[PDB]
Every structure is written in structure tokens, then in C-alpha cells.
A paper describes a structure:
Members of the DAPK family are generally involved in both apoptotic and autophagy pathways and share significant overall sequence similarity with myosin light chain-related kinases and triple functional domain protein-related kinases (Temmerman et al., 2013).
We addressed this question using hDAPK2, as its high-resolution structure provides the most accurate data on dimer interface interactions. In DAPK2, the main residues that contribute to the polar interactions are Arg47, Arg50, and Arg53 as well as the active-site residue Glu100 and Asp220 from the loop preceding helix αG. By contrast, in the DAPK2 structure, Glu182 is blocked by an interaction with Arg303 from the ARD, which acts as a pseudosubstrate. The fitting procedure identified a mixture of 51% hDAPK2 monomer and 49% hDAPK2 dimer as the best solution (for details on software used see Supplemental Experimental Procedures). What hinders autonomous ARD-mediated Ca2+/CaM interactions in the absence of CD-mediated Ca2+/CaM binding at the molecular level is not yet fully understood.
Residue numbers in the entry:
A (entry chain A): 1 to 304
B (entry chain B): 2 to 304
The structure:
């Protein structure tokens, strides 16, 4: 149960540019002095007691670390080390510096559904790895879908940010309200038992956006968004979906399901004919279906 | 009605940060023309419905609309509103005496009669809002401020109308918001909201004021939400050994899941802990004390 390292992080690491942050965490590029190899340092601020406004609980820090220690897959971020000082716990993580998937897609000259599906398959492969280990990510959304390097022809996806991830336990009910409203399943909004299915919903949301530039449930305010989610009110309006294949629409429709039991599981998603064509006729349809990147760019730029 | 389009810094000298909440920063200011001091709340405007940051126009207009309606001695008073390309700026009454709980934490001695003095001020403020069908929706200690620490019994101002909402008869309002420690079950459970949620939050505030302890606060949000939704709390003698039965009964009527059964603001004002009916009740309340040591220990942890 490797103890967290008590030595000063700056004594063993050079610290460079900010990569990002959340509410109680900041991420910075770093380099281990002894090896010269680069990583990302995630500084998580510790709480004072339990009614502290600021900082993350020990339970929550330790859960994130436990889960990260378990994971070794080519589509998931890998943990290098953990340090702790008076104010923070510092996670030294694989450096993933190629930006968000969506930023890369926004710069393309064109995108086919075949190309789209080989990005989505990479996400599905990392999620399958997690789900096989009974790990739910619980924060699947475009900003946590990162690329190693944006300058190879077909960039490699890494799932990041395990701050909400949780191990699903046999016969135990897990209920909580968390995440970004746009991307959360109805069981989160409704304070109902949660499990691996919630990740599958989020995958339908990400796929919908990827293909269209629009978001299925997003309203003018949070109040509207929550109402849309819980009533599963979304469309495939021709404004945004004119170019989309029927199999793409079927894939999404099978993920954006309220009843957790009826939603595709990760292995069912992987086998779905949009991802895994059954014949050449279908492979052709998928190759010839394009994404309107204009709409995609328009909406991605607006999120910035 | 229109927001002022002139540059706020042309009419105000702008000073130190006093607070920096959600997508809002509050700074001290003085209006050049009059010499009078105020607080300037700068609210970042959202750029798109899924902009990562900023606040929707709907939400800004709602806070302003509500602020424009409220004029009461226990409620912050709006002075003016300015808008630029970036922000909408609310010029508010400057409330400089700090948080109520910080004042209470310095005291040597606090009786329940004194505590009810402060609670009644909150109830008066809330009564004024509720009569206008305005739910505050963010009642918690950090929004209960003082004008001036240096009078015998300081004057309370309810601040921070960022979550406030007008409650319309027959129109269902459902949403999930607020600070978990302080939110009512109907918030957690995504059920119809109204004026009752504020009453729950008053019970929580009261519980904390009297004990230093928080009724539903768990080790993590997951535990807090389960505590709230099951209405799981206690009056542990560790924290409540000094507390009167009157005070416990007031709390017990507010920390109720069933919205219809929860005390209303008028019922809270008439409760005998607040408004004794006889001298026997008055003496019990006067003689019951708060253990300020526990209060202090717990308030300093929030620091
Ligand atoms: Cl802790
Ligand atoms: Cl876990
Ligand atoms: Na499409
Ligand atoms: Na907003
Ligand atoms: Na619910
Ligand atoms: Na007490």
C-alpha cells in the first residue's frame, strides 16, 4: 500500500506550465530530475476537517489513488508516483500533452463516420478495461478525452481525471449527485442507484456531440438541462443530423435510455454494427457518411 | 429598469476585494459624486449555453429583478446596476461588520435569549421575502452578515441573492443547487421547490448556532446527501447538554421532510422559543446557555 512520499516535490521535480485545474486541484507539467522524464503533477488540496469549504477529503483522495494504481491500459492515464505535504496530495501522472480530442477534430478538413468510430472505439476500449475491473469513471465528457500527440495521423486517446471514479460493489447501492449536468445520466439527477451504466449514457452524449456539434439535453440554464435529461427529451433534428447514418443514430438511441437495465453495456456497444460492421455493404455506408465539421467547429469555438 | 452602460470606474473609485464567489467578485467602492461607500459585485457574463464559465442572462436578470423589489432592514439593499462587454456589476449596500458566526465566536457568554435575538432578525428578513413569494434558496451562515460589530446587539443583513427565485402558484420549480450541508431533501430528491426549503435551512443554521455541530454533515458529500434524505440527525449530549427543550422542539419542527408539515415562516415566528407565551418559558430561555467553546472550536476549523 505504497506510502505517499513525504519529500518535497520540488526537490525531485522541475515544475513547468499549468495544464489545467478543477475546483480543488491544479495540474502542472513536471520533469523527474533523476531520470529527465516528463510527467503531469496534479496538486489536490486537502481539507481541514469535514465542514471545510475548501479541499478534498482524505477518503476521496485515497479512492482516486487506489483506482489509478490498478489501471494499466493504452487508452487510460497511468500513475507514476504520489507525494503529500502539509497542504496537498500530489499525483505524478503520465503526461498527456496533445490537447482535447475535440480541439483536434475541429481543425480537420473533413471527418467520416469511419474515422469518427475509430476515435469512439478507443474510448470504448478504455471504458471496457475499466468496466471489466468494476470501475466506473463517472466523469466521461469531452475535456477528459485527451490525446497523446496531435501530430500523428490518427491520434491516440487517453481517458483522464479519475476524481469521480468509483469501484462498483456487489449488492451495494451507491447514490450521489456529481458531475457536469450536460453529461450526466438520469440516475444521477434522480439520486438513484448508480453503476457502470452511467458511463454508457455519457458515451451516447459525447457521440451525439461529436457527430453533430449539438448537445442532446443542454438547455438555456441548468434547470432546463435537468428537466431534459430526466424526461429523456432529445432529437435528431435534420439541422444537425442531415449527414448522419441510421446506424449512428441507432447506436446513440440505444445508449440514451433511462432504464439502466435496457442501456447497452460496454461489450454490447463494442459489438454494435456502427462500431463493428457485419459486412462490406455496411462498412461502405459508414465510410461515405460524413460529419459536418462547420457545425462542429461553430459550437466548439462557442465553448471557449 | 435598464442597466447603466457607462464605465463603472468613471463613477466609482474601486478598491479591495471583499469576496470572490461563483462567477462573481465583490470589491469595495465609493461613488465619486456623493462620497458614499458600497460593494461592487462583478458578475461574469456567460458567452454560450455550454460556455465552461460565466452566468446566463436569465440568472443575472433574476437576481437583479429580485434585488430591485426588496427593501427591508434585514435585507441587503441594491443601489445601482452597470453592464459592460464582460460583466454585469451590482452596486450593493456595503455590509462591513463580518459574518454573524464570527461575532458570536468572540463572545464570552451567549444565552438562548440572546441567540433568539439574532435568529428573530433572520426570521424577520425571511418573513419579508416570503410575503413577496421570494425564496432566498442560499440561507447559510456565510450569507448572514452584520452591519457593525461594535453595538451591543449587532444588526443582521441577509445577502447573496444569486439563487433566489420567485415562487409562482401552480408553476412547478425543480432544480438542484446550493451547499449540500444546508439544502433541504426536496432539493436532493429533485422534487417541487418553494418557500419551505428556506425553513429547513433556518433549522440547520439554528442547530449550528446552538451547538457548533452540523445536523447532516457527513465525512463526504455522499454521506451528507444520505443523511439529508433520511432525515438522520441527533441532539448528542456532547453538543446539546445545555440546550433547552424549547430550542430542540423548534429545530425538530423545521427539520421535517414533508414540505407541508414543516413550519412556515409565520409559524416559526410564533413558536414559543422565539415568542414565549409565559414567564416560565422566558426564564428557561434566559437561563439556557450555548457552550461557546464547542462553537468556537468548530467555527475555527472553518478557517
Ligand atoms: Cl479528511
Ligand atoms: Cl471506489
Ligand atoms: Na452527423
Ligand atoms: Na448560469
Ligand atoms: Na430524486
Ligand atoms: Na445549546
Amino acid at each position: 500500500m505504497e506510502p505517499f512520499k513525504q519529500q518535497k516535490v520540488e526537490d525531485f521535480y522541475d515544475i513547468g506550465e499549468e495544464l489545467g485545474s478543477g475546483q480543488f486541484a491544479i495540474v502542472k507539467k513536471c520533469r523527474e530530475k533523476s531520470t529527465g522524464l516528463e510527467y503531469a503533477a496534479k496538486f489536490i488540496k486537502k481539507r481541514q476537517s469535514r465542514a471545510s469549504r475548501r479541499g478534498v477529503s482524505r477518503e476521496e483522495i485515497e479512492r482516486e489513488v487506489s483506482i489509478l494504481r490498478q489501471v494499466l491500459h493504452h487508452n487510460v492515464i497511468t500513475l507514476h508516483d504520489v507525494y503529500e505535504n502539509r497542504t496537498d496530495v500530489v499525483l505524478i501522472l503520465e503526461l498527456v500533452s496533445g490537447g482535447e480530442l475535440f480541439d483536434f477534430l475541429a481543425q480537420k478538413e473533413s471527418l467520416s463516420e469511419e474515422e469518427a468510430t475509430s476515435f469512439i472505439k478507443q474510448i470504448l476500449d478504455g471504458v471496457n478495461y475499466l468496466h471489466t475491473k468494476k470501475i466506473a469513471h463517472f466523469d466521461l465528457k469531452p475535456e477528459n478525452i485527451m490525446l497523446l500527440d496531435k501530430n500523428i495521423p490518427i491520434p491516440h486517446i487517453k481517458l483522464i481525471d479519475f476524481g469521480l471514479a468509483h469501484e462498483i460493489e456487489d449488492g451495494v447501492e451507491f447514490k450521489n449527485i456529481f458531475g457536469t449536468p450536460e453529461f450526466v445520466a438520469p440516475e444521477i439527477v434522480n439520486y438513484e442507484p448508480l453503476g457502470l451504466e452511467a458511463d454508457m449514457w455519457s458515451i451516447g452524449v459525447i457521440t451525439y456531440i461529436l457527430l453533430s456539434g449539438a448537445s442532446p439535453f443542454l438547455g438555456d440554464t441548468k434547470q432546463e438541462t435537468l428537466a431534459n435529461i430526466t424526461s429523456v427529451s432529445y432529437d435528431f433534428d435534420e439541422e444537425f443530423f442531415s449527414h448522419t447514418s441510421e446506424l449512428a443514430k441507432d447506436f446513440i438511441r440505444k445508449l440514451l435510455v433511462k432504464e439502466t437495465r435496457k442501456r447497452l453495456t460496454i461489450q454490447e456497444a463494442l459489438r454494435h454494427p456502427w462500431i463493428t460492421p457485419v459486412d462490406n455493404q455496411q462498412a461502405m455506408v459508414r465510410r461515405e457518411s460524413v460529419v459536418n465539421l462547420e457545425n462542429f467547429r461553430k459550437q466548439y469555438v462557442r465553448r471557449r
